[PDB]
């Protein structure tokens, strides 16, 4: 399979940028 060559090497930011983005988006929403 992919092992350590396809998607698991880009996960590091995927599992963490959406939390940062979600807190930012919801904070911009409540700031409106």
């Amino acid at each position: 399979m992919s092992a350590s060559y396809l998607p698991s090497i880009l996960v590091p930011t995927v599992g963490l940028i959406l939390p940062f983005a979600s807190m930012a988006i919801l904070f911009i929403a409540i700031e409106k």
Partner: peptide
Amino acid sequence: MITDNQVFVALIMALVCGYLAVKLAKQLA
């Protein structure tokens, strides 16, 4: 210096937020 497509996705997300405000301004279209 990693994930160039992710950088473009973050940039287009910010642009989509700005276009969302523009869509609010357009309204009727």
